[PDB]
Amino acid sequence: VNPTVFFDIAVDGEPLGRVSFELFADKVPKTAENFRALSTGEKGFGYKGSCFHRIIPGFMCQGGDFTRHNGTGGKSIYGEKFEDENFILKHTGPGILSMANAGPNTNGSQFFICTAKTEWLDGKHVVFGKVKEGMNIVEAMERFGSRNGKTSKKITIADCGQLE
Known part of the structure; x- marks a missing residue:
């Protein structure tokens, strides 16, 4: 019942x-x-064509x-920023999908895929999904990063949508 997006x-x-x-629609x-x-x-804006x-x-x-x-x-579908929904789910290892923010109740559209356990983020960033297929592709993306976060090549979401 939880949606799948690619x-x-x-x-x-x-x-x-x-x-x-997989997005945890049942919990967040x-x-x-x-x-x-x-x-x-489907709302006229979104991730297609954007970069990491x-x-x-x-x-x-x-x-x-x-x-x-x-x-x-x-920005979010609800406006410029929306609230922290809950902190039920924790950052328990690689593949976790969590919201980026700039303080309490400042979620927009930025997210991050964890490639490590990041337990110090628990209770500060809303966890809402997990990689289902293609963790190896995330690992390949990691090889284009650097210690300060700048990438050596442009990483783009060429296409994206819902699978189920």
Whole structure:
């Protein structure tokens, strides 16, 4: 019953591969629905064509800024920012999908895929999904990151949508 969304990743325009996510609509419905709708683009805006602007190997891949492409923009389907829904789910290892924010109740559209256990984020960032297929593609994305987060090539969501 939980939706599945996919990202087809590209590296400097070359296809890399496909990652799919399960979204925990059963536990964080508002958060999950924001990510789902931005992945289908059904509201007229969303993730298609946007980049992963910050990749720190051994920590996380961050993306979702589809308005300024650098970590300063983005927006939710509900408006500029919406509340922390709940902190039921924790950052328990690689493949966790969690919201980026700039303080309490400042979720927009930026998210990150964890590539490590990041338990110090528990209770501060809403966990809402997990990689289902293509963790190996996330691992490949990590090789284009750097210690300060700048990537050596442009990582883009070439296509994205809902699989079920």
